[PDB]
Amino acid sequence: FYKQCRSILHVVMDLDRDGIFARDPSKLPDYRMIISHPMWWDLIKARLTRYEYTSPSAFINDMRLVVQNCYDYNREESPFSTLARRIEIAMEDLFVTELS
Amino acid sequence: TSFYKQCRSILHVVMDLDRDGIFARDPSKLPDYRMIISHPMWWDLIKARLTRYEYTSPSAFINDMRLVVQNCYDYNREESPFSTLARRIEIAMEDLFVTEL
Secondary structure, three states: OHHHHHHHHHHHHHHOOOOOOOOOOOOOOOHHHHOOOOOOHHHHHHHHHOOOOOOHHHHHHHHHHHHHHHHHHOOOOOHHHHHHHHHHHHHHHHHHHHHO | OOOHHHHHHHHHHHHHHOOOOOOOOOOOOOOOHHHHOOOOOOHHHHHHHHHOOOOOOHHHHHHHHHHHHHHHHHHHOOOOHHHHHHHHHHHHHHHHHHHHO
């Protein structure tokens, strides 16, 4: 299932044109006070290279955390949240298509 | 009355408060940024304008400084974590404009 997970991560990383969810967000204002488990695409990619995921569900957990953290940190009306919803719809549909 | 010395020092204070340079560089590639924000502004652009003598009065410098933080409120919404940092910066620069300019 790693080939499929790697392929899905490549899709969301391309959808995120400016890479706003790609790098460590922990230095953003009050990020560590608000978000319990920061997550970002480059960490998920590294976890795939390190074989940390033993099931598709474990990869899906971390992918879901990136977009849920966006909604918990940013306002609903923010274009960051607009983009995260598009990414969420795309990746959730690809999980069903490729990993179920 | 002279003002460049004070504008430079206020800009230095603000750029030091913005520890990770959240508002220092061009934000125009952020999602839908040009659709939402008509006039993007950032600290490095204000610094370049000071260097190029583009300000002929303190009011023009104040306008650009206020624009950075108002653009943050408009893009991220007023009550948001990005806007909390911009508000602390706005508070600082308004406390210094009254006193220095």
